[PDB]
Amino acid sequence: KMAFTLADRVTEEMLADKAALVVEVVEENYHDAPIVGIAVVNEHGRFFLRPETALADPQFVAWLGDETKKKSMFDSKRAAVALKWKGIELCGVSFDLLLAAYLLDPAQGVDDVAAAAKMKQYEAVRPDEAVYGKGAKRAVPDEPVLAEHLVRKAAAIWELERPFLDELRRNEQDRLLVELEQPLSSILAEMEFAGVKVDTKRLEQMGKELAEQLGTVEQRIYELAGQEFNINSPKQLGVILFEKLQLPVLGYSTSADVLEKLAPYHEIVENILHYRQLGKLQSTYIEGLLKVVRPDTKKVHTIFNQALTQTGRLSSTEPNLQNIPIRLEEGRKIRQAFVPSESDWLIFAADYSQIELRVLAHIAEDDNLMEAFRRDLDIHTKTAMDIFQVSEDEVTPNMRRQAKAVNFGIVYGISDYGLAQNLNISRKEAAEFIERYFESFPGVKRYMENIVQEAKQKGYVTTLLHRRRYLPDITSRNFNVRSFAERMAMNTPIQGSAADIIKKAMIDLNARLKEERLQAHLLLQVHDELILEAPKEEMERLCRLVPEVMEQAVTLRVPLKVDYHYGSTWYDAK
DNA sequence: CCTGACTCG
DNA sequence: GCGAGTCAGG
Ligand SMILES: OC[C@H]1O[C@@](CO)(O[C@H]2O[C@H](CO)[C@@H](O)[C@H](O)[C@H]2O)[C@@H](O)[C@@H]1O
Ligand SMILES: OC[C@H]1O[C@@](CO)(O[C@H]2O[C@H](CO)[C@@H](O)[C@H](O)[C@H]2O)[C@@H](O)[C@@H]1O
């Protein structure tokens, strides 16, 4: 066993200006959740404190908020938010092991202290899952077992800080941790805690009108099929489409891509696609959303997973506010349900225009692509002009659409198969497009070749701010497995650098909002855009400040461009 | 608990 | 084709 003092009261030696701190929140969703225990490890020793006793002690609380008292933790955002819900401010977190491990190797999927420690051959700590269990069996163990687990985690963090910081320094990722990710952690904490206001009453009205339409398309489907069946059963649907109605096969696959091609054969296909759209808005964006709105404040408090994506992007859960409908008008209406939290306040949204491609232009130093952006040209029309060799005047809607698709392919790691599949054309033709694209953008071609070669030589690829991704399959003798890694080598520096940029913009924006003492604050981040809320009196100032700060986040060989809109609801901010 | 469907940048 | 999360079904 590990030695530790199971304290009954807080003592001075527990308030050293340097310590590994553990403020345990077992619940997955930490919003307004319980803190089941506390552990502190420092010069003087290892201690376990009960929350009701420590969070009531004015000295402990002052220590938690004393920024000069440095704390090392694992997932400090979790503790900070749980503490915000109790009116307690956590300050001075100088090292976060979860974020440190995430920068060192995102593929490891480090989600507990045990996994992080395993990276440095340290195993004197148990995986949280072995302690709390999971699912319907998850539970907080008795004090003895709980206290030892928390102390062991604190002791691990205490021991591992140095080794993790040393490696970060070698990787040139020390500043990435201390100046980007950790400060961002605190900003993400304020955003989650603030939450976003939902107009539940109008959301239930939409759910009512939706319920009526689904009933219509539903019965219309049973008619065209001359039989009732579970439309949501990919298995039952396959029977009705490929057996009863003899539709062509191009069990059974009824993916959206398949049905779009079957549409011309039978009227039922169109209806099944619409029914699926509406059915998705109903189950997820109506019923599912309402399930997570706080009844008392009518707010939803998302949780941004800051150490999950392989590219450095953020992810969002319970609910996922990074995938709210907008493409099809019927689903876009859902956004009229996200409103400001105060009367006379408005929603302000600012987004980078073509940041991936601008980053690509920068990194590849392609003359044509850099010139195009310097002229702030419509990138897809320009790409169409170059690959089809025609004047702007001769670009047809269909040419542009296809040049647009090629730009995606180039960004996601261009491949004969991938483009051909996306445009519903032959590979020989796709290779034809790609071929032409590289003729017009030789710089982009050189980069794709060089980055793949660099991935093979170094073993990984990096982003603008030194985030990295290891690509061991880049040397596989299996074509498919190797090709996956190659695309990643091409795409990660693009998607990854775009992530670094917007993360820094969030940090710069917040320092500016505070300098100006503006009431405006961040609500969400959707990969290449920032959503804020502020009194209407601050709109004119934000119109100049937000774009400015986002455009000046970093300096590239091409300018960064930001569009913005504001309105009464998220929907109107367009 | 795992597909196969949908949603987003 | 790159990166994500949620839900009804089986
Ligand atoms: O607190 C977020 C942080 O925790 C991890 C690991 O514990 O994920 C946990 O919390 C998420 C938000 O509720 C869940 O989606 C996830 O299933 C749960 O393990 C990290 O991945 C994350 O950075
Ligand atoms: O009780 C409803 C009953 O309807 C079936 C078809 O007869 O399913 C329809 O309605 C469901 C919603 O209640 C949808 O999920 C399903 O997609 C639609 O076909 C039966 O499965 C169900 O028992």
XYZ file of C-alpha atoms (C1' of nucleotides) and ligand atoms in Angstrom:
639
model
C 0.000 0.000 0.000
C 1.010 3.657 -0.378
C 1.464 5.787 2.726
C -0.753 8.834 3.163
C -2.453 10.910 5.837
C -6.229 10.588 5.790
C -6.795 14.089 7.162
C -9.811 15.151 9.213
C -8.916 18.828 8.880
C -6.876 21.055 6.549
C -3.362 22.001 7.676
C -0.785 24.558 6.554
C 1.596 21.895 5.222
C -1.208 20.948 2.808
C -1.124 24.419 1.307
C 2.414 24.391 -0.125
C 2.941 26.532 -3.229
C 3.563 23.426 -5.350
C 1.591 20.196 -5.370
C -0.126 17.534 -7.407
C -3.865 18.138 -6.947
C -6.692 15.651 -7.374
C -10.305 16.839 -7.189
C -12.207 13.733 -8.221
C -15.469 13.884 -10.176
C -16.540 10.354 -11.069
C -19.637 11.241 -13.113
C -18.876 11.335 -16.870
C -20.675 14.651 -17.243
C -19.072 16.817 -14.560
C -21.584 19.670 -14.772
C -22.999 20.393 -11.284
C -21.580 16.970 -10.354
C -20.249 15.743 -6.995
C -16.605 15.865 -5.985
C -16.139 12.517 -4.187
C -12.713 13.159 -2.675
C -9.529 15.202 -2.745
C -5.828 14.351 -2.694
C -2.762 16.530 -2.374
C 0.835 15.408 -2.753
C 3.682 17.861 -2.133
C 7.055 18.315 -0.372
C 5.598 17.490 3.023
C 3.744 14.345 1.997
C 0.581 12.722 0.667
C -2.873 13.727 1.904
C -6.509 12.791 1.372
C -9.263 15.271 2.241
C -13.022 14.796 2.267
C -14.726 17.424 0.021
C -17.347 18.570 2.528
C -14.484 19.325 4.910
C -11.972 20.804 2.476
C -14.295 22.911 0.318
C -15.721 24.525 3.467
C -12.302 25.455 4.841
C -11.609 29.084 3.882
C -7.852 28.439 3.718
C -8.118 25.485 1.359
C -10.486 27.457 -0.901
C -8.159 30.471 -0.834
C -5.302 28.127 -1.725
C -7.287 26.704 -4.674
C -7.780 30.237 -5.966
C -4.277 31.494 -5.190
C -2.618 31.641 -8.584
C 0.872 31.745 -7.023
C 0.212 28.300 -5.520
C 0.991 25.990 -8.460
C -0.955 22.781 -9.067
C -0.234 19.787 -11.287
C -3.329 17.831 -12.293
C -4.979 15.501 -14.774
C -7.923 17.008 -16.653
C -7.988 20.276 -14.713
C -10.978 21.467 -16.773
C -13.112 18.763 -15.158
C -12.228 19.972 -11.649
C -12.480 23.637 -12.572
C -16.006 23.288 -13.905
C -17.215 21.104 -11.038
C -15.782 23.795 -8.767
C -17.398 26.661 -10.732
C -20.806 25.029 -10.107
C -20.036 25.308 -6.382
C -18.904 28.929 -6.632
C -15.206 28.099 -6.177
C -12.424 29.318 -8.446
C -9.508 27.018 -9.301
C -6.343 28.936 -10.257
C -2.652 28.242 -10.706
C -2.835 24.991 -12.662
C 0.636 25.008 -14.212
C 0.665 21.465 -15.582
C -2.114 19.191 -16.869
C -1.014 15.572 -17.468
C -3.995 14.730 -19.722
C -3.087 17.554 -22.106
C 0.633 16.744 -21.844
C 0.034 13.135 -22.853
C -2.353 14.203 -25.607
C 0.278 16.429 -27.247
C 2.994 13.767 -26.969
C 0.887 11.157 -28.740
C -2.819 11.647 -29.474
C -3.169 8.091 -30.818
C -2.536 6.602 -27.381
C -6.026 7.680 -26.336
C -4.950 8.570 -22.803
C -8.092 9.034 -20.721
C -6.879 8.333 -17.207
C -3.770 8.850 -15.101
C -2.917 5.159 -15.413
C -2.603 5.258 -19.207
C -0.486 8.421 -19.112
C 1.845 6.926 -16.512
C 2.222 3.769 -18.569
C 3.959 5.927 -21.193
C 6.866 6.349 -18.735
C 6.922 2.785 -17.395
C 5.168 3.948 -14.217
C 2.548 1.454 -13.034
C 2.005 2.134 -9.324
C -1.532 3.365 -10.086
C -4.762 1.661 -11.208
C -6.870 2.555 -14.276
C -9.967 4.458 -13.109
C -12.132 1.758 -14.697
C -10.706 -0.945 -12.446
C -11.603 1.159 -9.410
C -15.013 2.606 -10.263
C -16.075 -0.073 -12.730
C -18.252 1.021 -15.643
C -21.833 1.170 -16.863
C -24.628 0.057 -14.555
C -21.899 -1.244 -12.246
C -19.965 2.029 -12.012
C -19.750 3.194 -8.390
C -17.644 5.070 -5.844
C -15.874 2.578 -3.540
C -15.557 2.889 0.227
C -13.312 5.633 1.601
C -10.319 3.312 2.165
C -10.174 2.188 -1.459
C -11.133 5.630 -2.826
C -8.545 7.484 -0.740
C -5.704 5.233 -1.870
C -6.644 5.517 -5.529
C -6.733 9.321 -5.438
C -3.419 9.556 -3.587
C -1.802 7.157 -6.060
C -3.029 9.306 -8.950
C -1.709 12.449 -7.229
C 1.628 10.719 -6.560
C 1.820 9.660 -10.222
C 1.199 13.208 -11.450
C 3.762 14.443 -8.931
C 6.403 12.037 -10.282
C 5.527 12.298 -13.979
C 5.455 16.071 -14.445
C 9.218 16.375 -15.049
C 9.531 13.469 -17.526
C 6.542 14.713 -19.539
C 7.802 18.303 -19.570
C 11.284 17.128 -20.600
C 9.950 15.172 -23.567
C 7.658 18.031 -24.518
C 10.737 20.268 -24.622
C 12.601 17.867 -26.917
C 9.541 17.775 -29.207
C 9.502 21.581 -29.109
C 5.993 21.292 -27.660
C 6.597 22.951 -24.295
C 5.086 26.271 -25.374
C 2.306 24.394 -27.157
C 1.256 23.039 -23.753
C 1.809 26.078 -21.507
C 0.723 28.835 -23.880
C -1.940 27.244 -26.071
C -3.623 24.117 -24.682
C -3.598 24.863 -20.940
C -4.790 28.453 -21.224
C -7.403 27.216 -23.716
C -8.545 24.693 -21.100
C -9.655 27.536 -18.806
C -11.481 29.250 -21.658
C -13.290 26.028 -22.570
C -14.225 25.767 -18.890
C -15.915 29.184 -18.898
C -17.791 28.381 -22.116
C -19.151 25.071 -20.865
C -20.088 26.583 -17.515
C -21.850 29.520 -19.212
C -23.863 27.143 -21.375
C -26.199 28.161 -24.194
C -29.832 29.174 -23.694
C -32.482 27.095 -25.440
C -36.001 28.244 -26.382
C -37.577 24.914 -25.428
C -41.088 26.180 -26.081
C -40.391 26.847 -29.757
C -38.401 23.635 -30.014
C -41.492 21.691 -28.953
C -43.528 23.545 -31.566
C -41.048 22.453 -34.212
C -41.259 18.934 -32.856
C -45.034 19.140 -33.236
C -45.009 20.277 -36.865
C -42.275 17.744 -37.592
C -44.338 14.969 -36.017
C -47.163 15.776 -38.417
C -44.994 15.777 -41.542
C -43.270 12.515 -40.631
C -46.711 10.988 -40.267
C -47.449 12.124 -43.820
C -44.247 10.918 -45.496
C -44.517 7.724 -43.426
C -47.990 6.775 -44.662
C -46.912 7.852 -48.136
C -44.120 5.282 -47.926
C -46.434 2.474 -46.833
C -48.572 3.335 -49.853
C -45.774 3.230 -52.423
C -44.653 -0.059 -50.903
C -48.167 -1.409 -50.427
C -47.159 -2.629 -46.975
C -46.179 -1.359 -43.534
C -42.661 -1.921 -42.223
C -40.005 -0.363 -39.987
C -38.535 2.311 -42.240
C -35.744 2.783 -39.677
C -34.714 -0.861 -40.023
C -31.915 -1.018 -42.632
C -32.817 -4.714 -42.762
C -36.586 -4.369 -43.250
C -36.014 -1.534 -45.726
C -33.613 -3.682 -47.737
C -36.310 -6.332 -48.099
C -38.888 -3.839 -49.374
C -36.483 -2.115 -51.772
C -34.461 -4.966 -53.267
C -36.967 -7.806 -53.006
C -40.565 -6.587 -53.043
C -40.013 -3.643 -55.408
C -37.241 -5.337 -57.403
C -35.055 -2.234 -57.255
C -31.542 -2.702 -58.700
C -28.584 -3.515 -56.443
C -25.729 -1.079 -57.098
C -27.558 -7.979 -46.456
C -28.460 -4.895 -48.500
C -26.915 -1.412 -48.443
C -29.449 1.417 -48.228
C -26.946 4.198 -47.553
C -27.834 7.723 -48.675
C -25.402 7.397 -51.579
C -27.147 4.245 -52.832
C -30.679 5.679 -52.681
C -29.751 8.902 -54.458
C -29.000 6.712 -57.471
C -32.088 4.522 -56.995
C -34.302 7.607 -56.777
C -35.076 7.655 -60.533
C -36.370 4.054 -60.368
C -39.179 4.436 -57.835
C -41.057 7.307 -56.160
C -40.546 5.633 -52.766
C -36.799 6.411 -52.613
C -37.354 10.174 -52.456
C -39.813 9.716 -49.576
C -37.480 7.403 -47.641
C -34.706 10.003 -47.816
C -36.938 12.840 -46.622
C -38.423 10.645 -43.894
C -34.874 9.900 -42.732
C -33.935 13.567 -42.651
C -37.023 14.582 -40.663
C -36.711 11.463 -38.535
C -33.185 12.536 -37.639
C -34.216 16.067 -36.671
C -36.949 14.584 -34.484
C -35.006 11.940 -32.570
C -31.775 13.891 -32.141
C -32.298 17.641 -32.496
C -35.729 17.788 -30.903
C -36.216 14.930 -28.426
C -32.523 14.306 -27.812
C -31.739 17.978 -27.248
C -34.629 18.500 -24.829
C -33.248 15.578 -22.801
C -30.123 17.584 -21.928
C -31.585 21.036 -21.364
C -31.380 22.001 -17.670
C -35.028 22.416 -16.561
C -34.120 25.247 -14.188
C -32.139 27.471 -16.565
C -33.214 26.117 -19.935
C -29.538 25.885 -20.846
C -27.462 23.100 -22.351
C -23.906 22.732 -21.058
C -21.719 20.897 -23.533
C -18.407 19.294 -22.660
C -15.538 19.901 -25.067
C -13.209 16.935 -25.181
C -9.874 18.716 -25.652
C -7.727 15.573 -25.831
C -9.430 13.215 -28.252
C -9.055 14.096 -31.940
C -5.965 12.952 -33.830
C -5.720 16.373 -35.486
C -5.950 18.763 -32.564
C -9.551 19.721 -33.219
C -12.029 19.703 -30.350
C -15.033 17.397 -30.087
C -18.357 18.105 -28.360
C -20.769 15.923 -26.363
C -23.956 15.952 -24.276
C -25.040 17.564 -26.416
C -22.859 17.835 -29.512
C -23.188 21.505 -30.428
C -20.763 21.160 -33.351
C -23.212 19.256 -35.539
C -26.461 21.259 -35.341
C -28.295 21.298 -38.747
C -27.646 24.111 -41.234
C -27.201 22.635 -44.727
C -30.875 21.874 -45.482
C -33.329 24.669 -44.608
C -35.753 22.368 -42.774
C -33.032 21.337 -40.327
C -31.500 24.813 -40.088
C -34.675 26.002 -38.348
C -33.508 24.048 -35.304
C -31.018 26.873 -34.691
C -33.851 29.323 -34.034
C -34.047 27.477 -30.698
C -30.601 28.620 -29.515
C -31.024 32.137 -28.217
C -29.067 34.580 -26.041
C -29.031 34.031 -22.281
C -30.003 37.640 -21.485
C -32.668 39.927 -22.903
C -31.420 42.493 -25.405
C -28.378 40.341 -26.087
C -27.644 38.894 -29.524
C -25.797 35.957 -31.104
C -22.552 36.843 -32.935
C -20.838 34.291 -35.194
C -17.495 34.694 -36.935
C -15.954 32.109 -39.258
C -12.730 31.733 -41.214
C -13.322 31.601 -44.962
C -11.449 28.668 -46.558
C -8.919 28.317 -43.763
C -7.814 24.809 -44.813
C -6.973 25.924 -48.350
C -5.304 29.134 -47.124
C -3.181 27.019 -44.788
C -2.362 24.688 -47.713
C -1.341 27.676 -49.843
C 0.960 28.808 -47.018
C 2.582 25.454 -46.186
C 3.025 24.374 -49.818
C 4.066 27.881 -50.862
C 2.241 27.313 -54.143
C 2.494 30.485 -56.222
C -0.824 30.115 -58.044
C -2.770 29.263 -54.890
C -1.109 32.087 -52.894
C -1.803 34.617 -55.631
C -5.420 33.440 -55.831
C -5.917 34.139 -52.131
C -4.049 37.442 -52.314
C -6.708 38.460 -54.853
C -9.362 36.991 -52.532
C -10.711 35.070 -55.533
C -13.538 32.577 -55.367
C -11.235 29.589 -54.913
C -13.516 27.016 -56.554
C -14.244 29.090 -59.641
C -10.504 29.750 -59.925
C -9.662 26.041 -59.535
C -12.216 25.237 -62.249
C -10.633 27.834 -64.543
C -7.218 26.232 -64.094
C -8.083 22.548 -64.403
C -10.518 22.952 -67.299
C -8.418 25.746 -68.811
C -11.199 28.271 -69.416
C -11.873 31.911 -68.551
C -13.973 32.856 -65.525
C -16.773 33.616 -67.953
C -16.745 30.064 -69.308
C -17.072 28.360 -65.906
C -20.372 26.494 -65.712
C -22.180 25.587 -62.479
C -21.190 21.959 -63.010
C -17.491 22.717 -63.599
C -17.336 24.739 -60.372
C -19.109 21.967 -58.455
C -16.501 19.486 -59.622
C -13.525 21.785 -58.994
C -14.992 22.231 -55.532
C -15.022 18.448 -54.979
C -11.414 18.240 -56.146
C -10.445 20.823 -53.539
C -11.894 18.552 -50.829
C -10.001 15.593 -52.234
C -6.753 17.558 -52.278
C -7.366 18.543 -48.662
C -8.336 15.055 -47.413
C -5.476 13.370 -49.257
C -6.255 13.084 -52.970
C -6.828 9.585 -54.379
C -8.190 8.161 -57.653
C -10.708 6.018 -55.739
C -11.864 8.739 -53.356
C -12.520 11.421 -55.960
C -14.037 9.035 -58.513
C -16.435 7.783 -55.855
C -17.357 11.301 -54.796
C -18.129 12.572 -58.307
C -19.600 9.279 -59.549
C -17.014 8.959 -62.310
C -14.310 6.507 -63.390
C -10.925 6.427 -61.619
C -9.197 7.051 -64.943
C -11.203 10.277 -65.051
C -10.508 11.158 -61.420
C -6.804 10.626 -62.069
C -7.413 12.942 -65.019
C -8.728 15.696 -62.716
C -6.049 15.228 -60.062
C -3.434 15.184 -62.808
C -4.696 18.500 -64.159
C -4.918 19.940 -60.661
C -1.252 19.255 -59.992
C -0.338 20.896 -63.313
C -1.994 24.135 -62.163
C -0.725 23.827 -58.576
C 2.760 22.234 -58.851
C 3.615 23.628 -55.422
C 0.779 21.660 -53.839
C 2.052 18.580 -55.652
C 5.603 19.030 -54.332
C 4.226 19.363 -50.793
C 2.122 16.193 -51.030
C 5.211 14.299 -52.175
C 7.526 15.866 -49.612
C 5.233 15.505 -46.617
C 4.727 11.790 -47.324
C 8.501 11.381 -47.566
C 8.995 13.379 -44.358
C 6.401 11.240 -42.580
C 8.408 8.171 -43.577
C 11.777 9.617 -42.519
C 10.754 11.244 -39.219
C 7.911 8.874 -38.416
C 5.408 11.686 -37.828
C 4.083 14.978 -39.241
C 3.645 18.319 -37.480
C 1.423 21.417 -37.570
C 2.170 25.141 -37.540
C 2.375 25.205 -33.750
C 4.232 21.884 -33.397
C 1.356 19.526 -32.662
C 2.298 16.109 -33.978
C 0.819 12.865 -35.214
C 2.758 9.610 -35.547
C 2.127 7.618 -38.720
C 3.558 4.082 -38.351
C 1.456 2.651 -41.208
C 3.307 4.905 -43.661
C 5.799 2.041 -44.077
C 3.302 -0.829 -44.372
C 3.671 -3.086 -47.407
C -0.122 -3.296 -47.521
C -1.342 -0.769 -50.113
C -4.618 0.108 -48.398
C -3.122 0.411 -44.925
C -0.226 2.462 -46.313
C -2.537 4.715 -48.344
C -4.532 5.612 -45.210
C -1.368 6.865 -43.530
C -0.309 8.825 -46.601
C -3.572 10.777 -46.751
C -3.194 11.505 -43.053
C 0.335 12.763 -43.709
C -1.086 15.159 -46.277
C -4.216 16.173 -44.350
C -3.067 16.463 -40.719
C -0.748 19.422 -41.250
C -3.695 21.199 -42.859
C -6.542 20.332 -40.498
C -4.116 20.422 -37.573
C -2.664 23.847 -38.325
C -6.169 25.225 -38.871
C -6.967 23.945 -35.373
C -3.882 25.553 -33.840
C -4.853 28.882 -35.368
C -8.435 29.036 -34.122
C -7.327 27.861 -30.662
C -4.885 30.770 -30.477
C -7.586 33.108 -31.756
C -9.810 32.051 -28.855
C -7.012 32.902 -26.405
C -6.242 36.259 -28.057
C -9.951 37.108 -28.291
C -10.517 36.483 -24.585
C -7.583 38.675 -23.561
C -9.030 41.435 -25.735
C -12.582 41.052 -24.428
C -11.191 41.464 -20.912
C -8.933 44.406 -21.780
C -12.040 46.120 -23.166
C -14.184 44.940 -20.234
C -16.802 43.788 -22.730
C -19.646 41.638 -21.428
C -19.435 39.577 -24.614
C -18.211 36.018 -24.175
C -17.567 32.844 -26.143
C -20.296 30.206 -26.220
C -19.066 27.720 -28.826
C -16.365 26.763 -31.281
C -17.257 24.830 -34.403
C -13.834 24.020 -35.878
C -13.402 27.130 -38.031
C -15.883 29.452 -36.344
C -16.551 31.140 -33.019
C -20.019 31.761 -31.590
C -20.484 34.502 -29.011
C -23.257 36.323 -27.210
C -23.234 39.908 -26.020
C -25.539 42.843 -25.325
C -26.742 44.477 -28.511
C -24.828 47.613 -27.449
C -21.571 45.754 -28.066
C -22.301 44.561 -31.608
C -20.546 47.424 -33.407
C -17.378 46.890 -31.375
C -17.430 43.121 -31.950
C -17.894 43.663 -35.690
C -14.370 45.115 -35.700
C -12.729 43.240 -32.836
C -13.662 39.606 -33.459
C -12.652 39.424 -37.158
C -9.505 41.419 -36.435
C -8.279 39.157 -33.627
C -9.101 36.003 -35.584
C -7.364 37.275 -38.705
C -4.276 38.314 -36.754
C -3.969 35.095 -34.709
C -1.020 33.993 -36.857
C 0.845 35.433 -39.830
C 0.807 33.369 -43.030
C 2.061 33.964 -46.575
C -1.586 34.563 -47.493
C -4.065 36.685 -45.540
C -6.687 35.071 -43.290
C -10.273 36.151 -43.930
C -13.160 36.112 -41.469
C -16.845 36.633 -42.146
C -19.345 37.354 -39.399
C -23.048 37.769 -38.750
C -25.254 38.433 -35.756
C -28.937 38.169 -34.861
C -31.697 37.259 -32.408
C -30.889 33.553 -32.627
C -28.087 31.272 -33.769
C -30.166 30.809 -36.924
C -30.208 34.557 -37.629
C -26.450 34.936 -37.211
C -25.901 34.380 -40.926
C -23.064 -3.366 -27.161
C -22.637 -2.854 -32.440
C -24.027 -1.620 -36.872
C -25.960 1.685 -40.368
C -28.152 5.895 -40.606
C -27.994 10.742 -39.912
C -25.594 15.486 -38.481
C -21.469 18.958 -38.696
C -16.597 21.532 -40.261
C -11.930 10.626 -49.944
C -10.120 13.933 -43.705
C -11.867 14.837 -38.607
C -15.981 14.168 -35.235
C -21.089 12.421 -32.154
C -25.871 10.574 -31.529
C -29.693 7.458 -32.233
C -33.008 3.378 -33.700
C -32.508 -0.937 -34.855
C -30.937 -5.841 -34.312
O -13.552 15.473 -18.854
C -13.349 15.248 -20.248
C -12.091 14.376 -20.442
O -12.330 13.092 -19.819
C -12.119 12.011 -20.751
C -11.429 10.873 -19.938
O -11.916 10.747 -18.597
O -13.462 11.611 -21.218
C -14.580 11.362 -20.286
O -15.558 12.473 -20.336
C -16.207 12.763 -21.637
C -17.185 13.935 -21.400
O -18.236 13.570 -20.505
C -16.885 11.464 -22.224
O -17.329 11.654 -23.574
C -15.892 10.256 -22.206
O -16.584 9.059 -22.538
C -15.326 10.043 -20.654
O -14.427 8.936 -20.649
C -11.219 12.612 -21.849
O -11.335 11.974 -23.126
C -11.655 14.079 -21.901
O -10.597 14.906 -22.381
O -45.969 1.580 -32.728
C -45.427 2.060 -33.961
C -45.157 0.873 -34.920
O -44.961 1.402 -36.255
C -43.846 0.752 -36.922
C -44.380 0.360 -38.341
O -45.702 -0.199 -38.320
O -42.775 1.767 -37.017
C -42.999 3.132 -37.537
O -43.044 4.107 -36.421
C -41.867 4.171 -35.524
C -42.155 5.268 -34.473
O -43.149 4.842 -33.540
C -40.554 4.421 -36.359
O -39.377 4.265 -35.562
C -40.451 3.431 -37.561
O -39.379 3.818 -38.406
C -41.832 3.553 -38.486
O -41.712 2.647 -39.584
C -43.469 -0.451 -36.026
O -42.076 -0.796 -36.047
C -43.904 0.007 -34.632
O -44.134 -1.109 -33.774
